[PDB]
Amino acid sequence: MDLIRSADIQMRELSRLTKETIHLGALDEDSIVYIHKIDSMIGRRNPLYSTAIGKVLLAWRDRDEVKQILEGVEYKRSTERTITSTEALLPVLDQVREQGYGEDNEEQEEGLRCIAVPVFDRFGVVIAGLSISFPTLRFSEERLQEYVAMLHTAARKISAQMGY
């Protein structure tokens, strides 16, 4: 597929620029599926509500489609920070749409942080999320903003190559 071929190039570029773990994820019913990865030094499945990619796959969607997708989900509290109801998640999705990126701030695993941005198809629907990992510590608003800016560049190229 063309999405993975374009993504592969831009993900290798982010890995080059950042040395971080880069993922490409897509919606599989009521979970995310990792479809590509470039490692720090693919088929894995994860919750929609605790992943940065999950948040971006939902945030631009019709909010009735969202509540539909999330109907079947059994929320599980992984960590202190995990969002564990639809009612708690919908306001988070508002912020994701507003700011243009989604995050997982130790919501799946202590010590793990991820930041993600939407990848659009030719119609403006989010078809994948493109993310960057993180060990949590050296937090810099500056690192976050630089990471978001480079994700957006990468995603816009992938989307353009999709016909967006």
3-state per-residue secondary structure call for 65-102: HHHHHHCCCCCCCCCCCCCCCHHHHHHHHHHHHHHCCE
The domain segmentation of the chain, as residue ranges, is 1-164
Q: Which CATH code, of 2.70.50.30, 3.30.420.40, 3.30.450.40, 3.40.250.10, is assigned to 1-164?
A: 3.30.450.40
- Tokens representing 55? 């948040």
Resolution in A: 1.8
Sign of the dihedral through C-alpha 116, 109, 142, 19: negative
CA distance 101 to 117: 5
Is 52 in contact with 129 (CB distance < 8 Å)? yes
Closest CA to 45 of 23, 13, 77, 15: 23
Q: How was this structure determined?
A: X-ray
CA distance 131 to 123: 21
